[PDB]
């Protein structure tokens, strides 16, 4: 079974990074909507952080799998 | 055909005369077409051994021949003003400026070629039945009286009407 670890600040770090990464990506790649202060609303923010919890969950599970944690 | 036959006829005669150093310890006492067989029993692919003698001949003759393949194909379709047989080979000036040669020397080449076709055909069949080889055959003008025990060729079927239908004096 792929090893997973109990929540630590390291798990938080990956999640925070991934959420911010997607918030910046969402400002760039969301085609229909002051780098983050133009046209930024809740559906844009709620979508980029939804992909952050998808990317972050995948990254956390993968880094636990290989040993990086 | 004539050039190959001239080479084969001279080759059979000189093979009877002597052999190169070390050939005798490998092939033994075979004489003409049997030596073709003997090498081929000792060569990779056809036989089992450490030799590539007939295969080396096939390799380099085949390189030359594919070159002449393109030459003949070009000459057939009229793309070239080259005559038959002319490969430009005349290293010693014999035709005095033309590699094709004079009318007389190409007539000589064709006539000697035709003679050598007949002659090497005779030599091969005289060996296939007596086993003597050119010079022993020409010496042994009474023939079938005592002949050399020589192997069956790689085409033994062809020597199967000799005894049953034909007389088989041997």
């Amino acid at each position: 079974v792929p090893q997973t670890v109990a929540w630590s600040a390291k798990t938080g770090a990956v999640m925070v990074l991934s959420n911010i990464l997607c918030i910046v990506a969402g400002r760039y790649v969301i085609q229909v909507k002051s780098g983050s202060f133009a046209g930024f609303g809740l559906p844009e923010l709620l979508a980029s952080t939804s992909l952050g919890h998808i990317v972050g969950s995948g990254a956390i599970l993968g880094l636990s799998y290989v040993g990086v944690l | 055909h004539g050039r190959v036959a001239m080479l084969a006829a001279a080759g059979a005669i000189v093979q009877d005369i002597f052999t190169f150093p070390g050939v005798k310890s490998v092939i033994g006492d075979v004489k003409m077409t049997s030596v073709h067989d003997k090498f081929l029993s000792m060569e990779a692919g056809s036989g089992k051994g450490d030799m590539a003698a007939m295969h080396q001949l096939l390799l380099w003759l085949g390189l030359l021949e594919i070159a002449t393949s393109v030459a003949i194909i070009q000459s057939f379709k009229g793309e070239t003003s080259r005559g038959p047989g002319e490969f430009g080979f005349d290293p010693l000036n014999f035709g005095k400026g033309n590699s094709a040669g004079s009318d007389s020397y190409k007539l000589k080449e064709i006539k000697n070629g035709r003679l050598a076709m007949i002659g090497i055909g005779g030599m091969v069949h005289h060996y296939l039945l007596t086993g003597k080889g050119p010079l022993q055959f020409l010496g042994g003008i009474p023939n079938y009286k005592s002949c050399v025990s020589h192997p069956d060729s790689l085409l033994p079927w062809l020597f199967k009407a000799v005894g049953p239908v034909l007389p088989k004096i041997c």
Binding site: - | I66, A67, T68, V70, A71, Q74, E79, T80, R82, E86, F87, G88, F89, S99
Partner: protein, 174 residues
């Protein structure tokens, strides 16, 4: 219009006397199948690699570098490849030649478009070709020892596949 090297063949259409190392040798018509400039770059690449390969064979007979005998005991010509894949030497040379090939690939596309001559990487640090007449004869000599080293590299490695001796050890031990 007859081939110089093969007198009974027509002069190959795609071939021209401007090319370095030209002798009219393409009896199979392979200069028409693939583009002649791609073929020139391929041949020159083969020339230079096999020149290093032949010189490497010869030099590795003559001497080895300090500590090499520690790592390679009896492996001589292509056995040293097998033992130095285990060690890092072969991977290192592969990485750096592949690094160079990336820009070589850009340069091959460049010479395809027509901006660059094949095999031309502007590498003349010691100014050997400055005269403009030496430059041509150097191009001819590069292709000549390049072709000869392709044949030689093959002819040594196969001599070593037979005997195991290597080039100089084949000669000295007949």
């Amino acid at each position: 219009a007859m081939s110089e090297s093969v007198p009974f063949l027509k002069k190959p259409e795609a071939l021209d006397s401007s090319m370095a190392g030209y002798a009219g040798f393409d009896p199979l018509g392979l200069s028409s199948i693939a583009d002649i400039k791609f073929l020139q770059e391929s041949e020159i690449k083969h020339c230079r690699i096999a020149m290093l390969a032949a010189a490497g064979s010869i030099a590795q007979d003559i001497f080895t570098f300090p500590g090499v005998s520690k790592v390679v005991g009896t492996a001589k010509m292509t056995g040293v490849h097998d033992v130095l894949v285990k060690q890092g030497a072969m991977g290192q040379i592969l990485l750096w030649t592949s690094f160079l090939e990336v820009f070589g690939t850009i340069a091959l596309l460049e010479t395809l478009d027509g901006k660059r001559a094949p095999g031309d990487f502007k590498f003349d640090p010691l100014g050997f070709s400055k005269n403009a007449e030496t430059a041509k004869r150097y191009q001819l000599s590069e292709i000549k020892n390049g072709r000869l080293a392709m044949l030689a590299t093959g002819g040594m490695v196969h001599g070593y596949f037979i005997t195991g001796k290597g080039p100089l050890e084949l000669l000295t031990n007949f």
